[PDB]
Structures are given as C-alpha cells and as structure tokens.
Amino acid sequence: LIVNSVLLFLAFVVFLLVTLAILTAL
Amino acid sequence: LIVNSVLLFLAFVVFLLVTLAILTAL
Structure with a gap:
C-alpha cells in the first residue's frame, strides 16, 4: 500500500x- | 527505504x- x-x-x-510545460508551449 | x-x-x-516536453516545446 505505501509504495503504490x-x-x-x-x-x-x-x-x-x-x-504546465505544454500550456506554456501552446 | 522503498518509498525513497x-x-x-x-x-x-x-x-x-x-x-522531453521542453525539448519538444522549444
């Protein structure tokens, strides 16, 4: 459970x- | 441990x- x-x-x-990177790219 | x-x-x-996304973006 904790690793998942x-x-x-x-x-x-x-x-x-x-x-956030493709919004900034667009 | 495993969580790190x-x-x-x-x-x-x-x-x-x-x-990758900046490489593609720019």
Missing part, C-alpha cells in the same frame, strides 16, 4: 508537469 | 518528461 501511494502521487506530479 | 526508491525513480520520470 507514493508512486501514484508522483504520477500526479508527472501529469502536472507535462501539462 | 520509488519516489527517486518517479522523480526521474519527472525530469524526463519535463526535459
């Missing part, structure tokens, strides 16, 4: 950061 | 997609 939790929340930072 | 590892590896994806 940390991983997923990190996977949310991953999505944020692509998104 | 999975976190550092998701942290590497974090740099990878941000430098």
Whole structure:
C-alpha cells in the first residue's frame, strides 16, 4: 500500500508537469 | 527505504518528461 501511494502521487506530479510545460508551449 | 526508491525513480520520470516536453516545446 505505501509504495503504490507514493508512486501514484508522483504520477500526479508527472501529469502536472507535462501539462504546465505544454500550456506554456501552446 | 522503498518509498525513497520509488519516489527517486518517479522523480526521474519527472525530469524526463519535463526535459522531453521542453525539448519538444522549444
């Protein structure tokens, strides 16, 4: 459970950061 | 322990997609 939790929340930072970079690109 | 590892590896994806996305963007 704790590895799955940390991983997923990190996977949310991953999505944020692509998104903030492609908004800034567009 | 394992939470640091999975976190550092998701942290590497974090740099990878941000430098991929800036590489594509610019």
